[PDB]
Design a protein around this ligand. Structure first.
Ligand SMILES: [Fe+3]
Ligand SMILES: [Fe+3]
Lengths: 203, 203
């Protein structure tokens, strides 16, 4: 079965940037529901196994009667698992190779941060802003709807911000760009490095 | 210019079903923002005018370069303006003709309630649950994404529930069902009758 991973720090470790009550519901309620629903969907078709990253890379392989529910809850599970690991109570620095890849893709770091901030601002409704590695090994900023994940288009995400309202409403209310800025404070760039390394090597 | 209509009651009027603070952010920030954005798009084409209900009934007729912004913000404005009129601090009752059409399409009021509750609850991500008049004059429950509106498909809304998280997170957190059950205590059935009469009387 899919399991709910633990937060690898205390619920309040990201304060004042993300508030402990949000971390608690976001993980114990929202995330747990994605895992519970993904298990129920998968229980229905044991023959397909449970490797979500493989199943959701090509959604039409998933039998029709559970497809949208797996996209939604199976995607909710993967997006959130990735998200907890990209957050750090301790400040970190963009790694040399990650930084170099950025200048190359965007021209400078501030250009990236601005392209990223804007994909996150203008994602209308519920969804996620992403930094991804191309099938060409290049970086792109994108944004997806709801729990849709870029791995469904063969893109490898190395950074991700959740812009569903539940992620920021208790701390920032309507002011999503305040929450976006706060995110840059608590990114775990070591996770980003590892994801990006894993992106290139498995290619 | 599109104007932000005033709430037709005090902000704390829907208490304890909807909290004051939410009414306040929801109208003063969320709806104001759609109104502002809708106007910025419209001003780029003064020739197409300001009749949002006509423009959004055929989206395709809207110049490509403001079409998405119009759908989202224009849609945002209609749905919300409709939403404030549908809420009532006084418990009202279902008008006889409305009750009868609900009995006909659904079996009983409570059947309708469960069905509208199902659409409101399973809408994944941001959106709206609706009771609409068919092209054939029949009632149907549906839901839509984000700020999409059933008038875009030649359906006439007579009941609407915002299921965006900003509509309910302050008072109910992740438990959208408690929000939905509460919405039924504050429905203005007189706004529903009136919309229902209007839908039948333009065909
Ligand atoms: Fe989330
Ligand atoms: Fe709303």
């Amino acid at each position: 079965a899919i399991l709910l991973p633990d937060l690898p720090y205390a619920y309040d470790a990201l304060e004042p940037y993300i508030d402990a009550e949000t971390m608690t519901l976001h993980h114990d309620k929202h995330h747990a529901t994605y895992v519970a629903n993904a298990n129920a969907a998968l229980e229905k078709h044991p023959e397909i196994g449970e490797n979500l990253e493989v199943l959701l890379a090509d959604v039409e392989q998933i039998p029709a009667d559970i497809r949208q529910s797996l996209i939604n809850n199976g995607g909710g599970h993967l997006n959130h698992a990735l998200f907890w690991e990209l957050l750090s109570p301790e400040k970190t620095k963009v790694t040399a190779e990650v930084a170099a890849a950025i200048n190359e893709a965007f021209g400078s770091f501030d250009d990236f941060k601005a392209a990223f901030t804007a994909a996150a601002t203008t994602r209308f409704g519920s969804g996620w802003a992403w930094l991804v590695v191309d099938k060409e090994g290049k970086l792109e900023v994108t944004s997806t709807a709801n729990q849709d994940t870029p791995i469904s288009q063969g893109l490898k995400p190395i950074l991700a911000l959740d812009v569903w309202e539940h992620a920021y409403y208790l701390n920032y209310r309507n002011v999503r760009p305040n929450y976006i800025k706060a995110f840059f404070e608590v990114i775990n760039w070591n996770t980003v490095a590892r994801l990006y390394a894993e992106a290139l090597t498995l290619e």
